[PDB]
Amino acid sequence: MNIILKISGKFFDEDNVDNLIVLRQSIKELADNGFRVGIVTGGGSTARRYIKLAREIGIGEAYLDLLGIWASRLNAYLVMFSLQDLAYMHVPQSLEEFIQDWSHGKVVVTGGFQPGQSTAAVAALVAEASSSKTLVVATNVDGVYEKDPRIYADVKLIPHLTTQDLRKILEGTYELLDPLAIKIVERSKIRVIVMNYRKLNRIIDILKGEEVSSIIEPV
Amino acid sequence: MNIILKISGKFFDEDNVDNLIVLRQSIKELADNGFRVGIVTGGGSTARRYIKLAREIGIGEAYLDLLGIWASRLNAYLVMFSLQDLAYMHVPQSLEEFIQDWSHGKVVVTGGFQPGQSTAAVAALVAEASSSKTLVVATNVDGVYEKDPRIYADVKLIPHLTTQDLRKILLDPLAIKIVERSKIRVIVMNYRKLNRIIDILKGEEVSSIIEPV
Amino acid sequence: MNIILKISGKFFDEFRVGIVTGGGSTARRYIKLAREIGIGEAYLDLLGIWASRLNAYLVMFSLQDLAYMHVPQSLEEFIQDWSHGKVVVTGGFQPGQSTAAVAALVAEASSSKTLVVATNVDGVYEKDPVKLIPHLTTQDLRKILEGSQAGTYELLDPLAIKIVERSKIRVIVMNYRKLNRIIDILKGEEVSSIIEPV
Amino acid sequence: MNIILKISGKFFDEDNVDNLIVLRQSIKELADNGFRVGIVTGGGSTARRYIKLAREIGIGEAYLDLLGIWASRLNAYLVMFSLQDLAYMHVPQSLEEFIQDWSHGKVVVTGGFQPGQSTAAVAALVAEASSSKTLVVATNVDGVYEKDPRIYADVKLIPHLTTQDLRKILLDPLAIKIVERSKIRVIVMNYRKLNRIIDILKGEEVSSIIEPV
Amino acid sequence: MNIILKISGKFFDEDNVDNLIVLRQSIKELADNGFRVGIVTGGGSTARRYIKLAREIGIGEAYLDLLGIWASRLNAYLVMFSLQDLAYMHVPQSLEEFIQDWSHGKVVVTGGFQPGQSTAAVAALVAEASSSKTLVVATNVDGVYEKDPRIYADVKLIPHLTTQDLRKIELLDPLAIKIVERSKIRVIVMNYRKLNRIIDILKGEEVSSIIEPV
Amino acid sequence: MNIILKISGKFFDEDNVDNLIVLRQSIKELADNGFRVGIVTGGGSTARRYIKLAREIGIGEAYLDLLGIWASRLNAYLVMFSLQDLAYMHVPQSLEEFIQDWSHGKVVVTGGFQPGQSTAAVAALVAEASSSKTLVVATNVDGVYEKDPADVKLIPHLTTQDLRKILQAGTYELLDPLAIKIVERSKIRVIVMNYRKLNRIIDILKGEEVSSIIEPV
Ligand SMILES: O=c1ccn([C@@H]2O[C@H](COP(=O)(O)OP(=O)(O)OP(=O)(O)O)[C@@H](O)[C@H]2O)c(=O)[nH]1
Ligand SMILES: O=c1ccn([C@@H]2O[C@H](COP(=O)(O)OP(=O)(O)OP(=O)(O)O)[C@@H](O)[C@H]2O)c(=O)[nH]1
Ligand SMILES: O=c1ccn([C@@H]2O[C@H](COP(=O)(O)OP(=O)(O)OP(=O)(O)O)[C@@H](O)[C@H]2O)c(=O)[nH]1
Ligand SMILES: O=c1ccn([C@@H]2O[C@H](COP(=O)(O)OP(=O)(O)OP(=O)(O)O)[C@@H](O)[C@H]2O)c(=O)[nH]1
Ligand SMILES: O=c1ccn([C@@H]2O[C@H](COP(=O)(O)OP(=O)(O)OP(=O)(O)O)[C@@H](O)[C@H]2O)c(=O)[nH]1
Ligand SMILES: O=c1ccn([C@@H]2O[C@H](COP(=O)(O)OP(=O)(O)OP(=O)(O)O)[C@@H](O)[C@H]2O)c(=O)[nH]1
Ligand SMILES: [Mg+2]
Ligand SMILES: [Mg+2]
Ligand SMILES: [Mg+2]
Ligand SMILES: [Mg+2]
């Protein structure tokens, strides 16, 4: 079926050929398992770096967001140019445009759409519009934690939880599933799989629940 | 300065030639009084009708939203055509497009942008992007009340309050988030009084002013 | 081959395929409201076109995964969207005509030999509310039509007739209630009126 | 006041610089006198040669039309490029696009829009959309006659007539339908005389004026 | 395999249906053998008819270029319209658009993109962007000779050469050469009269000059 | 009259708030002096980083260029966004689009257009299309030298042919081949200067200051 893959921005800040090489194989691996793949790429450091520079000279919040969006699109193009042929050569700039590009039956790579949200929201929207039952959020963490492994000791990894639990835990910045994202995944009952992009090579396993991952169930 | 005017959908469901006429005279006042007006029109009943009909046959939530957006755009075109020669002849379909159309120095009429939100959000976004310090929400009510007068007795009208007060109580999430971060004040008023919009803005005529916090 | 299906607007008020949807009551509801405040004729037409497109989206969205997700706004755009090999739903294109004309244009551009006009009547008559003409020609229809404008056009307006004739496209007028019985109407003779180009 | 100027295709076949020269002049003069000018250029011989050639190898009628449209656009670009800095640098490809380009307040040059009609229809549509009360059709003849003036001797020019008078005889069906419903008067004149365009418009120079009815 | 076909402007001036008839035939041949084909059409005489006229009244060099581009696009439409159902119905106006239109898997016909270059450069760019290892330049002459064959008894066609041997010497501008070299695209110069023997040309069983990148 | 200002990519790599400001200034100055300004922003390090990352996994040369172009547009947006309502809110992606955006009478900010060239070429094209008689190339250097600075001196006046003799996604040049070809045929003079002096742009333009003026020939 259809599946949306949200690649965290950090993924591009790293500068190591192996990242793209592996993401590319996994996009193929997912393909050879009868999977249509949509990919959303975040802005990463390029985004933050420009948002800061822009903010420094007083650029309004709306425009700071656009800069982050454009930065996320630059990453989108990078992913796409390595997916060449395999992907539809256009980076939709709105959900409506995505819906169109998705018609062509190839992989579609997206960046941001609108100010006031994050690529997480985009991933949700795109997942909903593409009838994807699963939204994989590949980030630099292994999964979801009750508090924060960085600041609290032995906060064991929650391999399963609902949009309710994730709400209490979370109870241009973000989260991982900002408000709009959660709202969308819930109304369209899309399950979110948080995993480490280091394991994109074991995505097929992740999807069928055989590897370190956190699955958020809609409720 | 710049100002955004959010016209509730009900405004178009009434079909009384006087609504468009009055709205048309007011956009002209604001204009001949040093304002650049941006207008956001809601889907109204057309939106609901199509959403209803579409839902009935199982159209996904994303697509029901698109239908409401297109309906809101149809109202956008209606408002735009009557103001001809005061408005830029294009209904932007995204904030990015709005920003572009706004460059032309004329009135810009908009409908929805993206699924998952309401024209309220669009009005906020558009207000923020156009550096509008005030977002006027023209609806079928006089303003904000501590609880709806429909059900509680002796509910007067809050002539002033802040985002926090409004919290304790249309403005969807994104709208509030935007008006707060960019400190945009929202003026809730009755579209029946668009002929007194200049007064409203300077705090006279009956209205509820939501202050950002 | 290819076939174009023109869905009358009333439909919403209640083999490759191209679909054209009319504005219906939404179109006329706006057209009268717009006219009331003096909106020019060109713009009234645009309102009708937008209304027709709104219907186009509704139809498109329901056929999802069968239709190319874009509503062309001009013949040139249609030709392009048609390249993708999926169903294409269209609304109006230009002022001064009706979706009928669009259907014809679209039929011609797509090399469709048949244009099916599904309306709120079983076929072509001679007058409305009288017998049903089960088989006529572009000339007979042109005559059955006559003079005595955003909102109201004739079954097949001037441009539609001109197009169907020059490209020899046969027009099948039916009842959208029998849309389901299209494989037969089309190829049968059932309760349909077939207009032969001449 | 807005005014639409339809330049006959022949204008470009003469490979006459003198024609483009006088056009710029009049566009410049019209602008001066407070007129917004929309220009529609026909396909001319280029359109002819291409359609001919295309037809020869069996291209469909729809596509032959598109080729004439493209050829009319090529002329549109030529006129535009010469009007540079006075014209909006884009040749709209549909009435909807024209409406948009016209918002920018500069001269807009157009070619064809859709198959099945002629630039005359385009001129009419564009005139209607831009609220022009006059559509000037500039051809290689001083005006309307009852028979061709170059062949028939003793043909007198008809200075005034009606849409019907014309029917009872340069204007395709759509064009006439449009000029009538929107009551646009059409002035047929010789493009050799465009520089005297200001006189033509005020009934103080040779020309045929078709009154809508 | 992807391949780009550059049709010289003269091709359209003969008002030769003969030419179009054979182009359409070889596209079919190419499609029928699993070749994706991108086509670039030059402005030909139409281009110079409009440029000459424009220059006459002082239109700037940038705009003269645009006129030639539009002229080449008009030819692009003509070729496209005859390929109907075999080609994507849009004439990209920039390399970025071409890349997009090419995604659709059908034949793409192009004209010019930007001022300051020729369709040759467009053909090279498009070849590079579409990963075509071969760029066929169909001219009205069998290939490249040692001495001009126009008026020079039979001379002798040189079957092999390099982009360097090309420099040591129309239909080839600076950008074109830079591109074919950096992306190592081989260029085949051949007569458009022979465009249906195109399958042979490509494999060496037919007359032509092959420029090797270096 | 019109003038095109080419901002070197390094200008954005310094990530200095001041950089953006002084620009926003000169524009207002230049503007307030009967000058319409077109601005072309290069890709800088962002472009370069992507061009190398992309190349590492084998992305073709055409696509590496596109990445550079998009990176240069990102800078274009940044510059545009900082120029409040002074600039037309759209980053043209082709000369044809530039010509259109330029009609609106406001500042237009551009990035790349097409593979195979550099923003220098874009600046030249844009200058020619906009009838600009002068193309200002603001780089981090002070002007031109027959050898990049060491110990060499600054050639205050040379010709495009002088530059030729004096003179791959990434590969720079001051003026690449297309740029020179364009500036020559349309006789556009190019003023090479240090972007540190954007503030003194009005002086530069009238000869009074540290700059190298390349005369077309
Ligand atoms: O649709 C969008 C996307 C992004 N943005 C803006 O750009 C920025 C990029 O937001 P992202 O959510 O793309 O950042 P990221 O990729 O680094 O996130 P993680 O992978 O670390 O989870 C955000 O901070 C926001 O301001 C929008 O405004 N809208
Ligand atoms: O940006 C938008 C706008 C609208 N919509 C969708 O279309 C519908 C129309 O959005 P409205 O905001 O017009 O809804 P409403 O009709 O209740 O508004 P008012 O009476 O208060 O004016 C909403 O119900 C929403 O689902 C979007 O999804 N996104
Ligand atoms: O190409 C087009 C299509 C439509 N329109 C405008 O849209 C409006 C709707 O005209 P339609 O012909 O689309 O309406 P309908 O669906 O009710 O028609 P029937 O099938 O019942 O006969 C008309 O008033 C017309 O002005 C155009 O101007 N141009
Ligand atoms: O909107 C349009 C315009 C033009 N065309 C097609 O292109 C051709 C050009 O139509 P024109 O009306 O421009 O022809 P022309 O140049 O000979 O006209 P004059 O001003 O010289 O009298 C026509 O023959 C028609 O087929 C369209 O299909 N649609
Ligand atoms: O990308 C382009 C293509 C073309 N042009 C401009 O348009 C004209 C037509 O471009 P051509 O490529 O047809 O010129 P040419 O005369 O060398 O062509 P062939 O006989 O080899 O087919 C050229 O003279 C050029 O000025 C551009 O500016 N850019
Ligand atoms: O039109 C364009 C512009 C840029 N590019 C691509 O963008 C990349 C950046 O080329 P730039 O010329 O934008 O770099 P820069 O701004 O840092 O240059 P200087 O002013 O310091 O000399 C180059 O690698 C090139 O391939 C294009 O391909 N086309
Ligand atoms: Mg609502
Ligand atoms: Mg009708
Ligand atoms: Mg004609
Ligand atoms: Mg460089």
PDB file of C-alpha atoms in Angstrom, chain E residues 25-200:
ATOM      1  CA  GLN E  25       8.560   7.597 -38.894  1.00  0.00           C
ATOM      2  CA  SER E  26      11.858   7.395 -37.057  1.00  0.00           C
ATOM      3  CA  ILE E  27      10.360   8.518 -33.766  1.00  0.00           C
ATOM      4  CA  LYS E  28       8.007   5.538 -34.130  1.00  0.00           C
ATOM      5  CA  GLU E  29      10.970   3.365 -34.941  1.00  0.00           C
ATOM      6  CA  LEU E  30      12.784   4.584 -31.839  1.00  0.00           C
ATOM      7  CA  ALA E  31       9.770   4.229 -29.553  1.00  0.00           C
ATOM      8  CA  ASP E  32       9.234   0.765 -31.008  1.00  0.00           C
ATOM      9  CA  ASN E  33      12.713  -0.292 -29.872  1.00  0.00           C
ATOM     10  CA  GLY E  34      12.550   0.923 -26.300  1.00  0.00           C
ATOM     11  CA  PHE E  35      14.258   4.267 -26.908  1.00  0.00           C
ATOM     12  CA  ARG E  36      13.034   7.294 -25.085  1.00  0.00           C
ATOM     13  CA  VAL E  37      13.426  10.253 -27.411  1.00  0.00           C
ATOM     14  CA  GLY E  38      13.732  13.910 -26.626  1.00  0.00           C
ATOM     15  CA  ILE E  39      13.548  16.271 -29.594  1.00  0.00           C
ATOM     16  CA  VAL E  40      14.885  19.806 -29.937  1.00  0.00           C
ATOM     17  CA  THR E  41      13.664  21.895 -32.864  1.00  0.00           C
ATOM     18  CA  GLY E  42      15.517  24.916 -34.195  1.00  0.00           C
ATOM     19  CA  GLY E  43      13.955  28.217 -35.205  1.00  0.00           C
ATOM     20  CA  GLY E  44      14.905  27.967 -38.886  1.00  0.00           C
ATOM     21  CA  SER E  45      13.786  30.665 -41.313  1.00  0.00           C
ATOM     22  CA  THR E  46      10.775  31.689 -39.226  1.00  0.00           C
ATOM     23  CA  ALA E  47      13.199  32.621 -36.470  1.00  0.00           C
ATOM     24  CA  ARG E  48      15.282  34.728 -38.814  1.00  0.00           C
ATOM     25  CA  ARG E  49      12.174  36.190 -40.467  1.00  0.00           C
ATOM     26  CA  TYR E  50      11.067  37.561 -37.108  1.00  0.00           C
ATOM     27  CA  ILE E  51      14.503  38.502 -35.877  1.00  0.00           C
ATOM     28  CA  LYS E  52      15.347  40.355 -39.110  1.00  0.00           C
ATOM     29  CA  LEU E  53      12.184  42.302 -38.900  1.00  0.00           C
ATOM     30  CA  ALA E  54      12.615  43.005 -35.181  1.00  0.00           C
ATOM     31  CA  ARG E  55      16.239  44.092 -35.588  1.00  0.00           C
ATOM     32  CA  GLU E  56      15.145  46.454 -38.300  1.00  0.00           C
ATOM     33  CA  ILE E  57      13.213  48.502 -35.742  1.00  0.00           C
ATOM     34  CA  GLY E  58      15.873  48.299 -33.065  1.00  0.00           C
ATOM     35  CA  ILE E  59      14.725  45.498 -30.763  1.00  0.00           C
ATOM     36  CA  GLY E  60      17.483  44.613 -28.306  1.00  0.00           C
ATOM     37  CA  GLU E  61      19.645  41.522 -28.699  1.00  0.00           C
ATOM     38  CA  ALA E  62      17.897  39.815 -25.736  1.00  0.00           C
ATOM     39  CA  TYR E  63      14.511  40.154 -27.345  1.00  0.00           C
ATOM     40  CA  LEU E  64      15.709  39.143 -30.759  1.00  0.00           C
ATOM     41  CA  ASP E  65      16.840  35.954 -29.041  1.00  0.00           C
ATOM     42  CA  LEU E  66      13.438  35.523 -27.444  1.00  0.00           C
ATOM     43  CA  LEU E  67      11.810  35.879 -30.844  1.00  0.00           C
ATOM     44  CA  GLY E  68      13.990  33.127 -32.232  1.00  0.00           C
ATOM     45  CA  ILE E  69      13.150  31.014 -29.216  1.00  0.00           C
ATOM     46  CA  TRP E  70       9.443  31.436 -29.732  1.00  0.00           C
ATOM     47  CA  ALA E  71       9.915  30.648 -33.398  1.00  0.00           C
ATOM     48  CA  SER E  72      11.743  27.466 -32.457  1.00  0.00           C
ATOM     49  CA  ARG E  73       8.858  26.670 -30.125  1.00  0.00           C
ATOM     50  CA  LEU E  74       6.348  27.086 -32.910  1.00  0.00           C
ATOM     51  CA  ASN E  75       8.304  24.399 -34.771  1.00  0.00           C
ATOM     52  CA  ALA E  76       8.349  22.407 -31.553  1.00  0.00           C
ATOM     53  CA  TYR E  77       4.550  22.445 -31.460  1.00  0.00           C
ATOM     54  CA  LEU E  78       4.339  21.416 -35.115  1.00  0.00           C
ATOM     55  CA  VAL E  79       6.590  18.394 -34.523  1.00  0.00           C
ATOM     56  CA  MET E  80       4.758  17.604 -31.275  1.00  0.00           C
ATOM     57  CA  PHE E  81       1.292  17.825 -32.848  1.00  0.00           C
ATOM     58  CA  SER E  82       2.321  15.327 -35.513  1.00  0.00           C
ATOM     59  CA  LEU E  83       3.701  12.951 -32.891  1.00  0.00           C
ATOM     60  CA  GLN E  84       0.322  13.155 -31.045  1.00  0.00           C
ATOM     61  CA  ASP E  85      -0.282  10.346 -28.575  1.00  0.00           C
ATOM     62  CA  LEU E  86       3.439   9.572 -28.698  1.00  0.00           C
ATOM     63  CA  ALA E  87       4.527  12.902 -27.122  1.00  0.00           C
ATOM     64  CA  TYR E  88       3.776  14.717 -23.896  1.00  0.00           C
ATOM     65  CA  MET E  89       1.603  17.677 -24.952  1.00  0.00           C
ATOM     66  CA  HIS E  90       3.717  20.534 -23.629  1.00  0.00           C
ATOM     67  CA  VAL E  91       6.771  22.346 -24.888  1.00  0.00           C
ATOM     68  CA  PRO E  92       9.033  22.952 -21.900  1.00  0.00           C
ATOM     69  CA  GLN E  93      10.473  26.475 -21.841  1.00  0.00           C
ATOM     70  CA  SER E  94      13.465  25.834 -19.555  1.00  0.00           C
ATOM     71  CA  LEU E  95      15.684  22.923 -18.699  1.00  0.00           C
ATOM     72  CA  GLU E  96      13.901  22.670 -15.343  1.00  0.00           C
ATOM     73  CA  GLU E  97      10.537  22.245 -17.068  1.00  0.00           C
ATOM     74  CA  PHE E  98      12.001  19.693 -19.480  1.00  0.00           C
ATOM     75  CA  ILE E  99      13.185  17.614 -16.550  1.00  0.00           C
ATOM     76  CA  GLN E 100       9.633  17.678 -15.266  1.00  0.00           C
ATOM     77  CA  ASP E 101       7.924  16.879 -18.566  1.00  0.00           C
ATOM     78  CA  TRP E 102      10.426  14.075 -19.134  1.00  0.00           C
ATOM     79  CA  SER E 103       9.137  12.357 -15.962  1.00  0.00           C
ATOM     80  CA  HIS E 104       5.969  11.420 -17.803  1.00  0.00           C
ATOM     81  CA  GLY E 105       7.747   8.845 -19.931  1.00  0.00           C
ATOM     82  CA  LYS E 106       6.663  10.130 -23.336  1.00  0.00           C
ATOM     83  CA  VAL E 107       8.466  11.996 -26.126  1.00  0.00           C
ATOM     84  CA  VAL E 108       9.238  15.603 -25.251  1.00  0.00           C
ATOM     85  CA  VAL E 109       9.697  18.283 -27.889  1.00  0.00           C
ATOM     86  CA  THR E 110      11.582  21.471 -27.079  1.00  0.00           C
ATOM     87  CA  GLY E 111      12.563  24.775 -28.550  1.00  0.00           C
ATOM     88  CA  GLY E 112      14.897  27.351 -27.057  1.00  0.00           C
ATOM     89  CA  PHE E 113      15.290  28.127 -23.345  1.00  0.00           C
ATOM     90  CA  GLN E 114      17.446  31.173 -22.803  1.00  0.00           C
ATOM     91  CA  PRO E 115      19.033  34.090 -24.739  1.00  0.00           C
ATOM     92  CA  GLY E 116      22.683  33.881 -25.757  1.00  0.00           C
ATOM     93  CA  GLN E 117      22.711  30.260 -26.942  1.00  0.00           C
ATOM     94  CA  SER E 118      21.289  28.093 -29.706  1.00  0.00           C
ATOM     95  CA  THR E 119      19.105  25.025 -29.794  1.00  0.00           C
ATOM     96  CA  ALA E 120      22.409  23.102 -30.027  1.00  0.00           C
ATOM     97  CA  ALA E 121      23.117  24.057 -26.442  1.00  0.00           C
ATOM     98  CA  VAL E 122      19.512  23.178 -25.527  1.00  0.00           C
ATOM     99  CA  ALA E 123      19.997  19.776 -27.131  1.00  0.00           C
ATOM    100  CA  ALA E 124      23.165  19.256 -25.080  1.00  0.00           C
ATOM    101  CA  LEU E 125      21.586  20.407 -21.805  1.00  0.00           C
ATOM    102  CA  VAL E 126      18.511  18.289 -22.425  1.00  0.00           C
ATOM    103  CA  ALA E 127      20.734  15.329 -23.324  1.00  0.00           C
ATOM    104  CA  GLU E 128      22.690  15.713 -20.089  1.00  0.00           C
ATOM    105  CA  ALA E 129      19.557  16.195 -17.979  1.00  0.00           C
ATOM    106  CA  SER E 130      17.910  13.098 -19.452  1.00  0.00           C
ATOM    107  CA  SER E 131      21.030  10.950 -19.135  1.00  0.00           C
ATOM    108  CA  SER E 132      21.269  10.472 -22.884  1.00  0.00           C
ATOM    109  CA  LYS E 133      24.628   9.123 -23.939  1.00  0.00           C
ATOM    110  CA  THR E 134      23.983  10.148 -27.541  1.00  0.00           C
ATOM    111  CA  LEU E 135      22.934  13.450 -29.064  1.00  0.00           C
ATOM    112  CA  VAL E 136      21.976  13.196 -32.710  1.00  0.00           C
ATOM    113  CA  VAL E 137      22.347  16.420 -34.681  1.00  0.00           C
ATOM    114  CA  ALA E 138      20.237  16.009 -37.795  1.00  0.00           C
ATOM    115  CA  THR E 139      21.402  18.445 -40.386  1.00  0.00           C
ATOM    116  CA  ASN E 140      20.837  18.634 -44.127  1.00  0.00           C
ATOM    117  CA  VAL E 141      24.195  17.109 -44.862  1.00  0.00           C
ATOM    118  CA  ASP E 142      25.317  13.493 -44.384  1.00  0.00           C
ATOM    119  CA  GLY E 143      27.945  14.352 -41.805  1.00  0.00           C
ATOM    120  CA  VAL E 144      31.311  16.001 -41.260  1.00  0.00           C
ATOM    121  CA  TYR E 145      33.819  16.149 -44.125  1.00  0.00           C
ATOM    122  CA  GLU E 146      37.483  17.209 -44.340  1.00  0.00           C
ATOM    123  CA  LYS E 147      36.606  19.916 -46.836  1.00  0.00           C
ATOM    124  CA  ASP E 148      33.213  21.595 -47.279  1.00  0.00           C
ATOM    125  CA  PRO E 149      31.094  19.364 -49.569  1.00  0.00           C
ATOM    126  CA  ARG E 150      28.640  22.134 -50.628  1.00  0.00           C
ATOM    127  CA  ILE E 151      30.695  22.901 -53.719  1.00  0.00           C
ATOM    128  CA  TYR E 152      33.674  20.520 -53.679  1.00  0.00           C
ATOM    129  CA  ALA E 153      33.379  17.353 -55.660  1.00  0.00           C
ATOM    130  CA  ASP E 154      32.430  14.537 -53.303  1.00  0.00           C
ATOM    131  CA  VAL E 155      35.237  15.372 -50.841  1.00  0.00           C
ATOM    132  CA  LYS E 156      35.275  12.614 -48.215  1.00  0.00           C
ATOM    133  CA  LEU E 157      33.224  12.196 -45.054  1.00  0.00           C
ATOM    134  CA  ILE E 158      35.195  11.604 -41.866  1.00  0.00           C
ATOM    135  CA  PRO E 159      33.378   8.882 -39.868  1.00  0.00           C
ATOM    136  CA  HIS E 160      35.177   9.537 -36.538  1.00  0.00           C
ATOM    137  CA  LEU E 161      36.418  12.549 -34.575  1.00  0.00           C
ATOM    138  CA  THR E 162      36.456  14.320 -31.182  1.00  0.00           C
ATOM    139  CA  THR E 163      35.104  17.472 -29.551  1.00  0.00           C
ATOM    140  CA  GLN E 164      38.719  18.607 -29.824  1.00  0.00           C
ATOM    141  CA  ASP E 165      38.856  17.856 -33.559  1.00  0.00           C
ATOM    142  CA  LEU E 166      35.607  19.831 -33.635  1.00  0.00           C
ATOM    143  CA  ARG E 167      37.392  22.819 -32.107  1.00  0.00           C
ATOM    144  CA  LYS E 168      40.226  22.330 -34.599  1.00  0.00           C
ATOM    145  CA  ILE E 169      37.414  23.449 -36.893  1.00  0.00           C
ATOM    146  CA  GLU E 170      27.721  25.281 -37.898  1.00  0.00           C
ATOM    147  CA  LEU E 171      25.518  23.342 -35.504  1.00  0.00           C
ATOM    148  CA  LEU E 172      27.720  23.543 -32.351  1.00  0.00           C
ATOM    149  CA  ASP E 173      28.147  26.445 -29.900  1.00  0.00           C
ATOM    150  CA  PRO E 174      30.357  26.884 -26.794  1.00  0.00           C
ATOM    151  CA  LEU E 175      27.877  25.766 -24.137  1.00  0.00           C
ATOM    152  CA  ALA E 176      26.983  22.704 -26.211  1.00  0.00           C
ATOM    153  CA  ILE E 177      30.565  21.532 -26.409  1.00  0.00           C
ATOM    154  CA  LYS E 178      31.224  22.281 -22.750  1.00  0.00           C
ATOM    155  CA  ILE E 179      28.188  20.179 -21.813  1.00  0.00           C
ATOM    156  CA  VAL E 180      28.807  17.217 -24.117  1.00  0.00           C
ATOM    157  CA  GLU E 181      32.349  17.082 -22.819  1.00  0.00           C
ATOM    158  CA  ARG E 182      31.635  17.297 -19.082  1.00  0.00           C
ATOM    159  CA  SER E 183      28.913  14.688 -19.314  1.00  0.00           C
ATOM    160  CA  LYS E 184      30.699  12.684 -21.997  1.00  0.00           C
ATOM    161  CA  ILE E 185      27.866  12.609 -24.508  1.00  0.00           C
ATOM    162  CA  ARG E 186      28.760  11.530 -27.993  1.00  0.00           C
ATOM    163  CA  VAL E 187      27.411  13.618 -30.832  1.00  0.00           C
ATOM    164  CA  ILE E 188      26.277  12.091 -34.117  1.00  0.00           C
ATOM    165  CA  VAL E 189      26.087  14.514 -37.036  1.00  0.00           C
ATOM    166  CA  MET E 190      23.837  13.236 -39.810  1.00  0.00           C
ATOM    167  CA  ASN E 191      21.523  14.256 -42.627  1.00  0.00           C
ATOM    168  CA  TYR E 192      17.879  14.633 -41.597  1.00  0.00           C
ATOM    169  CA  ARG E 193      17.032  13.213 -45.008  1.00  0.00           C
ATOM    170  CA  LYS E 194      18.153   9.891 -43.493  1.00  0.00           C
ATOM    171  CA  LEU E 195      16.342  10.077 -40.115  1.00  0.00           C
ATOM    172  CA  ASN E 196      14.599   6.702 -40.520  1.00  0.00           C
ATOM    173  CA  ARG E 197      17.876   4.916 -41.112  1.00  0.00           C
ATOM    174  CA  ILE E 198      18.442   6.376 -37.650  1.00  0.00           C
ATOM    175  CA  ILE E 199      18.616   2.940 -36.084  1.00  0.00           C
ATOM    176  CA  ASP E 200      21.479   2.052 -38.411  1.00  0.00           C
TER     177      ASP E 200
END
